[PDB]
RNA sequence: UGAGGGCCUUGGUCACGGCCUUGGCUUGCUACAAUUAACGAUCAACUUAGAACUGGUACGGACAAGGGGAAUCUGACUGUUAACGAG
């Protein structure tokens, strides 16, 4: 995991010439050409993270800052792992056990809770300091939570349809599908991205082109 | 002559540091030379295959198995006292 400054003058410079220019110590003709090949868009400016904080085992799927704490850093992996960290230290604090991998983690601050999607079809809820939704078909890609209510949440799958639940059941409400001539269900169906926007509804996107607008408003 | 970076700076803005704006090393497009680059640089590969010292050769000097020579009679028998026979 990255720990980067949206002002990058806070960040040290790195330099793509100085590794192959300042030792020069055997660095063939075709290394240098591949990569000056690397350069061809112009000298942009390059800056280097402010911390790598690196305890998974597998690839990281998703990381969120603290609705609150802003210092706190809960993370999901593929190594079935929820692991929250310590900015300030860029150290892994506590880690919970999962038995598949997740795909995507959401906090309800609300209510002190953490949803994760994992590729078992189901979200977990976990106390960061339980219940499981089930019913979707597929990976469950990207979670998202209702802005006005604190116990709703839209969840978006690899099957192609989104679906808001309710914390305290255990069922999908609403069950959204792509509304689309031209798409197949199995074939071109799925849904990368969804989002709760405050203004607008619920925004879905993925394999097919389209991107989808609903209501979600009482 | 356009782009991107670096040092400058000018105002408004939020408690030395952000946000919005103002004017002055890399690469892109064009114009005249060079096309003997038939040059130069760099990375990577490369170590000494030789062993053996056998004899028969022509020559120079002594041994080599061992008493010799001639002619007639005689036995199978050619082209000059023909030859031959361990007679």
């Known amino acids: 995991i990255g720990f980067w400054s949206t002002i990058y003058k ?52 998703q990381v969120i800052f603290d609705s609150t704490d802003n210092t706190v850093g809960y993370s999901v992996s593929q190594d079935h792992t929820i692991k929250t960290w310590d900015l300030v230290t860029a150290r892994c604090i506590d880690t919970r056990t999962t038995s598949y991998s997740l795909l995507s983690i959401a906090q309800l601050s609300t209510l002190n809770l953490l949803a994760c999607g994992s590729s078992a079809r189901h979200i977990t809820l976990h106390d960061p300091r339980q219940q499981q939704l089930i019913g979707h078909k597929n990976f469950v890609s990207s979670l998202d939570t209702c802005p006005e209510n604190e116990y709703i949440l839209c969840s978006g799958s690899h099957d192609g349809t989104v679906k808001v639940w309710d914390v305290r059941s255990t069922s999908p409400m609403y069950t959204i599908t792509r509304e689309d001539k031209s798409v197949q269900k199995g074939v071109n169906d799925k849904v990368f991205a969804v989002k709760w926007a405050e203004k607008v509804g619920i925004i879905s996107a993925g394999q097919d082109k389209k991107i989808q607008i609903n209501k979600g408003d009482n």
């Not at 793509?16 to 350069?39: G, V, Y």
């Not at 904080?53 to 690839?59: F, Q």
């Open 10 to 61: 806070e960040m040290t410079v790195v330099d793509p010439l100085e590794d192959i220019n300042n030792p020069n110590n055997k660095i063939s003709t075709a290394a240098r050409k591949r990569r000056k090949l690397t350069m061809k868009d112009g000298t942009i400016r390059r800056r280097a993270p402010l911390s790598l904080l690196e305890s998974h085992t597998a690839p990281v799927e």
